[PDB]
Symmetry: D2
Subunit: 305 residues, 4 copies
Amino acid sequence: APKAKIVLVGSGMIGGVMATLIVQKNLGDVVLFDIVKNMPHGKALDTSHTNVMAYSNCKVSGSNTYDDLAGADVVIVTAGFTRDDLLPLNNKIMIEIGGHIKKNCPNAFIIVVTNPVDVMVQLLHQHSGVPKNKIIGLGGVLDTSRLKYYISQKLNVCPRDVNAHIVGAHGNKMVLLKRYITVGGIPLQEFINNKLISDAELEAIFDRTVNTALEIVNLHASPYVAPAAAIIEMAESYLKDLKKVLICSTLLEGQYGHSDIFGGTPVVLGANGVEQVIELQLNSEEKAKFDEAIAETKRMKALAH
Amino acid sequence: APKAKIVLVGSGMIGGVMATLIVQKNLGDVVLFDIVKNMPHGKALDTSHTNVMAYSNCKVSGSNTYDDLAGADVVIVTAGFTRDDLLPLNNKIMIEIGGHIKKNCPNAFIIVVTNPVDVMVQLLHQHSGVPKNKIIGLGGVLDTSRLKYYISQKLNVCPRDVNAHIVGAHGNKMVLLKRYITVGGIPLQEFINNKLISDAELEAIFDRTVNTALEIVNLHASPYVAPAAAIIEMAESYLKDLKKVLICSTLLEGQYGHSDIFGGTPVVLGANGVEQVIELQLNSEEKAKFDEAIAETKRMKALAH
Amino acid sequence: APKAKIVLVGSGMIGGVMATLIVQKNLGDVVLFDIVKNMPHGKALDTSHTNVMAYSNCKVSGSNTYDDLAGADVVIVTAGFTRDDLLPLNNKIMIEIGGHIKKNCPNAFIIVVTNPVDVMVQLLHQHSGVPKNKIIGLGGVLDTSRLKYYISQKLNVCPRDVNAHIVGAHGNKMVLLKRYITVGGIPLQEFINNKLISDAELEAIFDRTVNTALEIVNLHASPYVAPAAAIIEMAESYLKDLKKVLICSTLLEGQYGHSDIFGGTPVVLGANGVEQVIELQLNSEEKAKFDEAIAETKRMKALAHH
Amino acid sequence: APKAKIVLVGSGMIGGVMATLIVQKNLGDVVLFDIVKNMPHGKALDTSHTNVMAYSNCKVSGSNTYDDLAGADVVIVTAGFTKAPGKSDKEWNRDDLLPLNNKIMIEIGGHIKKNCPNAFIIVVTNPVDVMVQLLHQHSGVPKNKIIGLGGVLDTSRLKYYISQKLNVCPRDVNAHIVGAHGNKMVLLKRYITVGGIPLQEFINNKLISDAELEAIFDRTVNTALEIVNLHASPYVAPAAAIIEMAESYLKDLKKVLICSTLLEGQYGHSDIFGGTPVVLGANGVEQVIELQLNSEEKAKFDEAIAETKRMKALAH
Ligand SMILES: [Ca+2]
Ligand SMILES: [Ca+2]
Ligand SMILES: [Ca+2]
Ligand SMILES: [Ca+2]
């Protein structure tokens, strides 16, 4: 039973990090695909040597052809133009990639990163024909990583012991659910009651979370290390059948009162892809914000067509 | 620099697994101490060879003298007779061990496993003179691992994505708190509302959790693999300054309306030992069960003296 | 893919360690099989809880039925009586286990631990009908771990930076090859010439390596932790297609001038099982020792056959 | 107790990968230091979020001040000129960067001496064997506490290429490249093993040919150039090699790793740094292993050292 084959459609900064992490974790053979000539081969060569340091045995190859999607177990899509004017252009890219997925790897697990993700993931779902349980978009794992981390540094606890939920869409309409924040499994409100962190501090953290991509772009460049790690967490849960509860963009079929659209919600990721879609029991305020996120996704989807 | 020194006071079944895991994780040099002659040297020799398989470099040594406590960074006490008649006998074991700790490693971080833990950890605290933030008892990490695991199997999610709190005492008066169970950070109640698990199933799991040690004894022996892993999780948090929120038996100084006694509650474990003691905001009914647990610890503490 | 299924035929102390390490490494679901009713279920329950501590998701189940070999990807055989009087008794056990492997998992990767391993592995091969690339015996990984570790102590280097080769058979006739010892890839002779370790010290280490099991038993302990870790290293190389070079008991078909017998030699373990069998280019002195090891394996196999 | 503090002097592509791997392995708190404004803070912020995914707790911060060297346990220097400022590719050569990077080593060395005189220093600035000695001289750090990257990176290429011809786990190939990190690197064919077995046995069995090896050797020496010619650049493997060295130090692993270290008579050389196997543990360079080289190998070692000396003379 051979290694998983993981094809990275897009070999930019996020691609490079993903390939690095895949080798570190010995997750599978890697293809770095890009339309840019030669570059993916150079990155692939550089990364391949790290098998020695990592005590791994993963092949890492570059590619300039979609034909290398053949036999892929996991496809991660970061390719795309980098706002509203790009929607129809990136739709065409999803049509192209989707057609190649359909013929080369129709049973692959597909993770879409191309922004705006909630729109682009549905466009690829439609153009590739893959089942709803085998395609998801990056969102909540990345967004909550910021919220979890910032709260952890205020409370002086292990970052992953903060859990949190951000839903609806990946972008400015992301819905931060204060009521669903826990610290070591304990409601955050208890820490607020004890004066360990204030409502004002939290509002500042919420604002920072929403604007993190902009903050980092202003300082340096579009974030890529945390996005890569978030994607690999998702990919690993699939490949190792870990059944982790992770927030991703997934097809809504009545959840939150919505359908024929993708939105961010907790899901269980295992060997069968999206094994469960978990509908949070939202109150009216939270729901209202969820609906606003979906409306913005629907608006941009209309423009993409 | 140099490596941590971890002394296992008791080289029985739990000790053997601890030494194995320490080498796997390259956590520090190990001393397997026991009153039984030769045996700890034999287990140490066997375990030491696993450095090759593990790509680690941890010394593993046997000992029959408390002088090997000299320079210990972590001390883990599993020694003791294995009910109420044993309390004064194990009190004398805690007096002996405490005296040697005070002499050889007064600044070590101490983890007590000797049952009943909540009593024995306080006795060792009093006889060793160590600070209250440097001595804890095994309890909630082990007890909650059972609860978390059983729920994860019913819901088909990653075991560690279930978080749960069991407090008060490690033993038959352990307090299982339904309200503080989460799944991927989502309250367990949501899953109950969705009919994914019933309250009857949950009650059965609660009963199974309380009686797990007995169940395992009736099939084999007093559990040792999970206890060992739970202890190493705690020791690792200390040694690597992870600041994990872990439930342990710790000195209460007013929390839950109790003092001059040790009880199970969530704490933060990092380089400074017990960095925080977290008091759950229990309702009156939960608090009443907590008081029953403490009452029993106090009852047995009186008999120990 | 769904997880690998690993069936431990024998759930003694060695099995417990194997199950523990499998969960730590998230290597696959685990079945603790044994011929006593309750114990494997007890051990399985205890170990299953460690998924929480390990952030793993491996099922750990007890079993009293060979039907649980169905769907097995790896089968690790430690069952048997625990000297030459035991040979035909354990052969009878290999006949039964081999029959159930043939029936339930004819293409599983089989690792045999039951002593004497070079005899027992061939017996199971014959009684199971599994291909020669899918059945190996524990030996060299364990024996060399001892030699590697003791040398590393003397020289004060990382234990795994010592590499060494012990071949022929797992047991008292094991052939320690001084010529194939390296430290960080550097021949050990350089360290001897430099007076960092002496020939006398090395001889003592060789003696200690051969007698390690006896030493541990004389210390009122039982050797099972390192044997378990060695077996898991082998199983992992197979399951993750690492293609590690590991010394295991394997079917010889001409190598070293021997055939129709299993002996210890470096092999490459990957997704196709034994992908390569590496024959060390031994000199006449080393060859003669190898021959003594094989002769002893043949002697014991004759006592085992029915 | 508490965590090690690791300061990355230089927050470029190698720095970025290093920070990522440090968090993955929970090795220590990280400081991304650079002269460039804002960028190290942005990289640090991005990387810090990965603590959640990795179940780690390493602080990652950006810095534009040498004050952050205070309390450093490990200092990794990737800073330096890789091209002549404002010059086109045709009017500078490698030798021109030597006196410029000397001045950088003087500056960094002075701040190390002031702020962390006993930190473990790993120098990556090319050509390493020159620059590590310059930093040693300008910082006054003890000889057991300063090393240069070379052999771990160069051998990873050779080990990897051989492994894919022989179809074995990459790390089961062991190999030694010594003398210097650069075009004069000395590939020791005689010392290559595969699962501890001399490579020659595999050549004897026709599993790989002398010609194949010779092509592999040439590819190893020219890998950096091959990667640059493919419109990429080598920073992932360099970062992983550096972290393997730092990890051996911080975890007291006592791994045998080939690094640039001060020679005090080994191979007949002194007052110079060169690549040789060392043992890295809690006391830094715990052992310097002198290989018993034959004449052809010794000749190439001497050539590598002569080139390092030539470049050092220009750097001064
Ligand atoms: Ca984004
Ligand atoms: Ca108990
Ligand atoms: Ca044996
Ligand atoms: Ca270079």
